[PDB]
Amino acid sequence: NAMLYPVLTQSRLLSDLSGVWNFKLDNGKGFEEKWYEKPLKDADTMPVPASYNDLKEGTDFRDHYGWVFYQRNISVPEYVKSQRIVLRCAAVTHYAMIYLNGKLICEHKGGFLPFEVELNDDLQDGDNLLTIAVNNVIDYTTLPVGGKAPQNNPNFDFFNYCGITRPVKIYTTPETYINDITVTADIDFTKEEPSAVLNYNVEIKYNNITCKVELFDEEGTKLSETEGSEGTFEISNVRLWQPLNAYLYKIKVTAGQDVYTLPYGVRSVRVDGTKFLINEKPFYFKGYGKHEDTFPNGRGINLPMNTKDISIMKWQHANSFRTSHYPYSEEMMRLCDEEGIVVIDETTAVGVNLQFGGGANFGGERIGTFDKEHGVQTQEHHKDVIRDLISRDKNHACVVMWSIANEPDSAAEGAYDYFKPLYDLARELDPQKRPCTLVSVQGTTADTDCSSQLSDVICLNRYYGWYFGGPDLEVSETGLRKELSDWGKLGKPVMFTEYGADTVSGLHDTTSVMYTEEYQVEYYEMNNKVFDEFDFVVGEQAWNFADFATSQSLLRVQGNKKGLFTRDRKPKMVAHYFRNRWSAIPEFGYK
Amino acid sequence: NAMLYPVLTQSRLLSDLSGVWNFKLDNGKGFEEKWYEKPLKDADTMPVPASYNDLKEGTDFRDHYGWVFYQRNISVPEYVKSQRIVLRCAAVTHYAMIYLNGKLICEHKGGFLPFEVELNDDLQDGDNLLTIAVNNVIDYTTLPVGGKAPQNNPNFDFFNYCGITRPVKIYTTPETYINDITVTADIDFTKEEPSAVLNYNVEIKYNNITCKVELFDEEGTKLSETEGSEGTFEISNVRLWQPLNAYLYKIKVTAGQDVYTLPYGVRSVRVDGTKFLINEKPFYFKGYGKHEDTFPNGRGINLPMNTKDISIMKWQHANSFRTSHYPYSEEMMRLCDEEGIVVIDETTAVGVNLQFGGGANFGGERIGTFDKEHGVQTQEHHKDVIRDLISRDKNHACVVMWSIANEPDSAAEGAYDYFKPLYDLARELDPQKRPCTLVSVQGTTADTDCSSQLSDVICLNRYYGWYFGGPDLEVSETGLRKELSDWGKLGKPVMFTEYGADTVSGLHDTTSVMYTEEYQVEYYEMNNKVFDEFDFVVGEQAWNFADFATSQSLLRVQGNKKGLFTRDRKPKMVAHYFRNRWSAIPEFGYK
Numbered sequence A, B: 001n002a003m004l005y006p007v008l009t010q011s012r013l014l015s016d017l018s019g020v021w022n023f024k025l026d027n028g029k030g031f032e033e034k035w036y037e038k039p040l041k042d043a044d045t046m047p048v049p050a051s052y053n054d055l056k057e058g059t060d061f062r063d064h065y066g067w068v069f070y071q072r073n074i075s076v077p078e079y080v081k082s083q084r085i086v087l088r089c090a091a092v093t094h095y096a097m098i099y100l101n102g103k104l105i106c107e108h109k110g111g112f113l114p115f116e117v118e119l120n121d122d123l124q125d126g127d128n129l130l131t132i133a134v135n136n137v138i139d140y141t142t143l144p145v146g147g148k149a150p151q152n153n154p155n156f157d158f159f160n161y162c163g164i165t166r167p168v169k170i171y172t173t174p175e176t177y178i179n180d181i182t183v184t185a186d187i188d189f190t191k192e193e194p195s196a197v198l199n200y201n202v203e204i205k206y207n208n209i210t211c212k213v214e215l216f217d218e219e220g221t222k223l224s225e226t227e228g229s230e231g232t233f234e235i236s237n238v239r240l241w242q243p244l245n246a247y248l249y250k251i252k253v254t255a256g257q258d259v260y261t262l263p264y265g266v267r268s269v270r271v272d273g274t275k276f277l278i279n280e281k282p283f284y285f286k287g288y289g290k291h292e293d294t295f296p297n298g299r300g301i302n303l304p305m306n307t308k309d310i311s312i313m314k315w316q317h318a319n320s321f322r323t324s325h326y327p328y329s330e331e332m333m334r335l336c337d338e339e340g341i342v343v344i345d346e347t348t349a350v351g352v353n354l355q356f357g358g359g360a361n362f363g364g365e366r367i368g369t370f371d372k373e374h375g376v377q378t379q380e381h382h383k384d385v386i387r388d389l390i391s392r393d394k395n396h397a398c399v400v401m402w403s404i405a406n407e408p409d410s411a412a413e414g415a416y417d418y419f420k421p422l423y424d425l426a427r428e429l430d431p432q433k434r435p436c437t438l439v440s441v442q443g444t445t446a447d448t449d450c451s452s453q454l455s456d457v458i459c460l461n462r463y464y465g466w467y468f469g470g471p472d473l474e475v476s477e478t479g480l481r482k483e484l485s486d487w488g489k490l491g492k493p494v495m496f497t498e499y500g501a502d503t504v505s506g507l508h509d510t511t512s513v514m515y516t517e518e519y520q521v522e523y524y525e526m527n528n529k530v531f532d533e534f535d536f537v538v539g540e541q542a543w544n545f546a547d548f549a550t551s552q553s554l555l556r557v558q559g560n561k562k563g564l565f566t567r568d569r570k571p572k573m574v575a576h577y578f579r580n581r582w583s584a585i586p587e588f589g590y591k
């Protein structure tokens, strides 16, 4: 349930298992021949962390269907068995099965969230045979959703990168440990010098022991102390965490023979009318929808590209993005804390719409998305994911909002009844009672979108001037203004979380045509002109930040080319257009 | 002196320090204000491992001159202070100064080789302030060499990527530990089923204790045992490590309360006449000169790209490369062991030639390279580097040769006397008495090159058809045949370690011109035609494997575009040409 980011501490170690592991593709007979017990014969090499799909040649590898086997030797000195020994998987994509010496010791469904397992019982003095098996199959029971029509069929527009996506490490704790930590903030904005009070709450598991919780500022000075599993601080004249201007207090929580620190930023999130308020000021989202996508790591974690992406944002004068379409690495989340970037944390819930791909049929009847017997089997797991996500990222001052799903069939029979339990579960599990949304596919209207009722903020993905209307930007404008005007009638805040136009870097014309850099700039001029007409529009997020990989098809020119930047982060012409527009537009008070 | 690759073992831990550190650029007043004692004020973020030059925007960052400061908190639990606690720096570029709490505890000159420091004495229960400062200045006393004409002036054709290039980890050992391990092999090739005997030799530092050394095969079976600091095995019907067909025995060396394993491949390297023999067969080098260069890591380690590079080689039917122009990561070296790739391990000794850049002058007299007062001050350090390199990579069955320097002024007054001490030091420190070379700049002839005497193999970097003769490939051919014919008269083996032609991916013509993909293919046709005429040519290595970054100048179209592949590893047309040529050409017996 609870998952704190493993770091180095006086009481806990951190042994990164990253490196070149042994690796074999399953042929079917894999589990039969109990490969997890023996070391893999005729093996292959494969770095961890990383998606495996692009690190070898040939379609047989990129396009593989099913299971892969990672192996490796691990060994701990007996002098460390005094502590409890846990194996944390930052993320395995999609389904993981972890053996040790040949004995299944764990299982996890869910390809983008961490999960751990205790090792004490199964550790065997000497070198041990660690085998993690990974499965890439997606169907109507996975999140993201795999379609219908031996090969996967992603019901989503990005490539099915699989393998050990994020790092596999080992850490330890004294057998009575800190397990969760929760921290909230009530900020008093009436004062001339605003001050605030932090509510904490530590959870443990000989659980009776002293509970020290000290508070430092970013320089390192100590400022307060308190005792108890729950407690309080009264930071006066507090330094508010702000977008593009972060401040991180530190929180050293001593308890028994265990210490853990947690950066924390003080800020307030509140909707009010047509105004998305951060620290009781009216925000405007400037930014993009992103992917964890790079060459050749695939979806694998890339701490260098994370910092380079953030550099480019601060260069472009952006302030937000959205973890389309799955939670990002803990490391990227921590970085947004230090760097001051507003994030829209979003679940793996993409592809629950079921009209894509010309749809699937049953008895000559086209299935509806939320059909009880033939449609998405994903609410059980969709709920697990809301739980794991918020348990992980609850404390991140950068997360100002939750995205329950991306482009679900939210205007359909069965939709409201699928999402209500999920929103409720989100607004009840988030200690900071943060706004909740979902990203509405093209086609929905204010009248028909089950998001008009459940959502604190309306998030549209619209393509007026690309799929709908292009190349006639004038007509497309009238379309966008008409629909946008309608959404105004809800009185809620509206933002675009996705708009864009495929552009192959290099293609130009003085009089533009689709796919050229000139057309891409003109498309954003038209859209943005209309955005600026309506004071309830509180955010623009382009799709996408950068070119990224997709399953092949006629519509996809060697991937999705809707990026403002090429896949190696080099600016298309539109990147300068946006950088100039965002420069003349503030974080606060644009309305 | 001795540096074994830190791994996970029953007796030793491995705590990778990689992550986002604190980071500030020096302004001059850095050391004055003793920033290493306090935590950095107004800091910045920076992933480690990685060059910092490309991870922020603006020339002030990319082009910075001088010092940078990395900071970070480290903390060990007192229950681990029983063992000795060492901080290993895989590589800092160029000069590192390591503080702890404010007390200089280490220093290293040398930007591409590992170096460690014991922490027990300076560790202070609690969180500690680890500050590594890094310096990028190059001049006549550094390897590589920095030129003359506040900015660096690389006397080499690649970008001055600096910062913490390879990972910083922490490992431990029992206070009497294994420190080095050496292993050689005499192979008996007379038998029908060749067998061999391995000579080992362990070094330690209560040094009196038992010495167990067990031998396993790759599957994991144990095959032998022996006791003693020195000893022997008699692997019968042995499995010879071969190029593109690796086999790795494992060697578990128990000694006191310490275990360490070391993969090892059995093979023989021997020159004989005009024939470079691996396992007493006549090899032909197929491959390229490489860089540790990727976006945006710079020179920083990239285990995903390492595996992807090796995939591409096996796709192209290559078998070798050369660590131009500095030693690569230990991880890449280990990988070549498992993958079966022949490496030419090479020192940081590039830019000792001093005729580049129009040269530097003194009293109206142009300085010669090896002038005793005004020229290269680098033999002291050049010798350290030969030592560190061979102490690190001595056991790697993939290293079949040593490159002392790249394009030194080897036909000049003073040259022979500079290199003789260095070769000798190389042929005496390498337990396997492996061939030694240096890469000869254009201009040298057999008669004039001090490499004709010192070197077991002649390695030419020639550009007939690019800088010299291009665009007239016919004339250039006559030039190449004439010079090449000459080198034949030494009776030694000759190989080209560098040839190539800048090619901007995308530029084409039916009737080619320079910089097009068609010209690049034609240039290699001409060169290779002449190579194939001479049976003493035993290797072709293209320059370069992939496009890489350089200091700016008119001659460098957004970097060095001589790659067979673009900087993101995508094939230029020549890559298919080579893949087809190398397919019809074996590892052995091409002559």
Ligand SMILES: Cc1cc(Nc2ncc(Cl)c(N)n2)c(OC(C)C)cc1C1CCN([C@@H]2O[C@H](C(=O)O)[C@@H](O)[C@H](O)[C@H]2O)CC1
Pocket: A156, A157, A158, A325, A353, A355, A356, A406, A407, A441, A442, A443, A461, A463, A467, A498, A543, A560, A562
């Ligand atoms: C092109 C299309 C059309 C329709 N409608 C429709 N199609 C064909 C015909 Cl003949 C017809 N009459 N109508 C449509 O809705 C129907 C099918 C339910 C959906 C969408 C795409 C699905 C994915 N998106 C979002 O934008 C990104 C991108 O496309 O680049 C994705 O990468 C990203 O995940 C995603 O967030 C945009 C629309």
Ligand SMILES: Cc1cc(Nc2ncc(Cl)c(N)n2)c(OC(C)C)cc1C1CCN([C@@H]2O[C@H](C(=O)O)[C@@H](O)[C@H](O)[C@H]2O)CC1
Pocket: B156, B157, B158, B325, B353, B355, B356, B406, B407, B441, B442, B443, B461, B463, B467, B498, B543, B560, B562
């Ligand atoms: C172009 C040149 C010319 C001369 N000679 C000369 N220049 C101008 C004039 Cl007017 C003149 N009459 N003669 C020369 O030798 C003299 C200067 C000592 C050296 C070289 C380059 C130095 C670097 N190399 C190697 O190839 C790679 C690459 O160039 O791409 C590098 O990246 C790589 O490090 C390196 O291994 C090739 C030659």
